Amino acid sequence: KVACIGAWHPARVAFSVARAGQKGYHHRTEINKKIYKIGQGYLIKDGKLIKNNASTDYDLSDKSINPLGGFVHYGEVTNDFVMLKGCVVGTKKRVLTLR
Amino acid sequence: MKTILSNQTVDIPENVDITLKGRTVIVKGPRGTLRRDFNHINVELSLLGKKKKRLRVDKWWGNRKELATVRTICSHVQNMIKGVTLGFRYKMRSVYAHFPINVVIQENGSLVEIRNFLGEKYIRRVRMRPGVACSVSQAQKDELILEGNDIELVSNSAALIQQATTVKNKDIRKFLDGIYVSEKGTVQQA
Amino acid sequence: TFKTVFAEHISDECKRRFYKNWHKSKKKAFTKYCKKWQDEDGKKQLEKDFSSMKKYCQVIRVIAHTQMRLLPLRQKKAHLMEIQVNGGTVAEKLDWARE
Amino acid sequence: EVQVLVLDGRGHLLGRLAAIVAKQVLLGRKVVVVRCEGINISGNFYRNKLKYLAFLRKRMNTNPSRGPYHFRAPSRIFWRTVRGMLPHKTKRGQAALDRLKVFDGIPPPYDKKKRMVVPAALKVVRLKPTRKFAYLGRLAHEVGWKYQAVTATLEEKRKEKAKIHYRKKKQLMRLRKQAEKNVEKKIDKYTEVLKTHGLLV
Amino acid sequence: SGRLWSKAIFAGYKRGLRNQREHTALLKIEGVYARDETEFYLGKRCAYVYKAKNNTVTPGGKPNKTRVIWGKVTRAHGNSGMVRAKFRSNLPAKAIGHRIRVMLYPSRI
Amino acid sequence: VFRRFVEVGRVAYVSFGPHAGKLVAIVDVIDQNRALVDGPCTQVRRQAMPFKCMQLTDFILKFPHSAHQKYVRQAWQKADINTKWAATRWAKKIEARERKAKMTDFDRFKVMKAKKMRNRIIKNEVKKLQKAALLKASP
RNA sequence: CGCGGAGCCUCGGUUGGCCUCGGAUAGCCGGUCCCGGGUCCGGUGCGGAGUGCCCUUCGUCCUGGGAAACGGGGCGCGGCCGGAGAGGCGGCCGCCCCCUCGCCCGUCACGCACCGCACGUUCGUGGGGAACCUGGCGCUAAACCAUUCGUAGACGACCUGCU
Ligand SMILES: [Mg+2]
Ligand SMILES: [Mg+2]
């Protein structure tokens, strides 16, 4: 708890004192997230699909951005993707607005 | 006490032909033209002559404070007339004890930049007023030579580049460095 | 907001956004609207609504939507968004958006 | 008298115009005040800005969302001065205060109507010319009014449509004067009756 | 044809600051704003014409739903127009800021 | 600016006060506010008047300051001020302004019919003058 | 879409309009000749004036003279154009269609002339609500609950899915 929620006078609780209530699910805008990669989706090219959008020029493996077993609580990413540095708001499957 | 009448007349040479659009003095001479409005002062301006063209200015029931603005108008008009026939010229020396202040003039005399003031790395860049052209002299080793028509723009441009070279956090009874206005002259010395 | 113009063929994943219950509806949204792209008296209404929007508006915003059938999610209802168009004059950014 | 009263706000002192408006609104009399950026306040600018910034500090510190509502447009600063001259806690003063419409700039119901001027509230009448004054449009800009640039671009657009109106109205005035010389042998009888009884000097 | 009465505003009752006397009304006649300009009006009949829900009788016609409270202008009030008026029954406070007719009956012109 | 000056001999027009509507002449000046003032031919005996009552005209008489009554009377009579006034437009505007006020109910009727006819001809004529200015067919 | 009709219910105010320069104030306004200017000419206790201007309403019939004749009138049709700050408005044309009347000054007589007496005169086909007849032209939905979801959750709310 918060032990004191205000003095005697003003004879009211001010708006600045910590109170209990809703946590999370608030709209937030955070800035200066750097893009690290704009990834290409699975495209079917010569009859069989090219799936190497997590390859680098140092790795050269034929692997997708999907971890083994897929992204947890999400699914798999077959479309174009953006790789941002760090953490962003929301759960998995949250629609993000990126401007 | 409010004085019934306080006038002061200004002689105008034959080079300049000033006009009066109300309380706006448009002076026009060989070095260009100038313009100020005096519509923050309640006076009457009138051209007098037909051959010599004086300029009077009257106040009509002024108190003491209003009676001071008459001769200021006359002094501003006379600095317009000196500005469009002779023009204004400020020579300012660069004083330094150890680190030579390097001034190089940027685009067509509109911007100066000052490199080595007290031996430091930040580069002062101070823009002149519109109409003031700065220059580096050839008569002496290090003086700026900036010049123009209007006195309140030539003088402001010297004040910007003098307050740009302020010594901070030191005693300024030693450390006398900076660029300081050395004389207030004219072009076309009569 | 001055004037809004929609396209002729809006897909069902975007038309699903306009309903609270897709399953009980008769799917009638933008059906009287789309006929004025194949009309003449309603056709001439459209380019008057572009040219007035060309001569009054200062801000243009395109109305775009995602396409949820490429995503592995349960949701089929797409998300609409106004994305504004920077750069150029208003007449320049308008016929860009019509293409 | 059922029409509204359209007052130009420009050149008028704030509280001299407000006592004029507040007495009319209590006597019936719908009144519209347009162009509230032109309203002047006497005393130099910095002095009057401090009185608004001193007002911006009065807020209920327990919950300032309940507090004094500090309106920042020039039309809504003027609207609170005339409210302070009204008995606005009663039904009579609340029914007064909605006979008053205030506007920034001149909106398109009132741009094609001729404005009135109250001479007992003008700056050129009520101040000595060597006294400093301020503008309500400038002072609202430094306290947080978002829109003096867009309101200035719409006032300069209104005026150039209004110059075209004037020089066409004035073009008909010299055709009417041209007509009075064409027809003067057939209206000399009627211009004698009007000149006898005090019309037509 | 024509208006034939002069239009006036019901301003308020004869009052002090913290007392009002409802038996005397205060009127502002449009057009007169000085006390020397108000001697014309000092005996004139005056009416407060209003409408209500039920029909009442009309002298000289079928039952309308207009009703009248009649009064007289008795004296001047102040230095700028503003006569005061005595009505047969006191004016309702609903009427404050509405129209009162001033009539040109009993004449002295 | 400032064509009309308070000086000795300046003829003023009294705008309000008890002597309202009378021409009068400035004889001497007192203390920035008042003026010694005399109308010998307009029934205003010599007295003091504030300058805010009086409105300056264009007429100046020639007599020295604080002369007696007879020297401002005869300066009034030659270069006759009473007949130069009531020939200016400003005395004509006053003459028209009061005869509009002393206009009876029947004279307002005769003016109403006359002005209604007079504006029919003028309005008819400007229809013709602006449709003849409309007959223009040049690039 | 009609005023198309018939009646109602209910809320009342109101008693002719002004359709627009921008501004200056120790200065303004209006015309004009030469390249929006300079000249020039006027006005300025603003008369090209809000201390103003415009509309004016007894109705008709006899009958003349002026103004007119390039006109008037149509919720006449058809087209065009202007206006976005709250456009909610304002124009210009083409064809039809009736009227030579309406505006001033006159002849000529007439209308409940209701017998001294109040709420008369407008806006106004006002607003609002129901019901009816008459025509045309049209139109055929969602929302909530239940259900499912878990990006949500104390409960409601929110996010979802269902030939
Ligand atoms: Mg130290
Ligand atoms: Mg804020």
Ligand SMILES: [Mg+2]
């Ligand atoms: Mg009524």
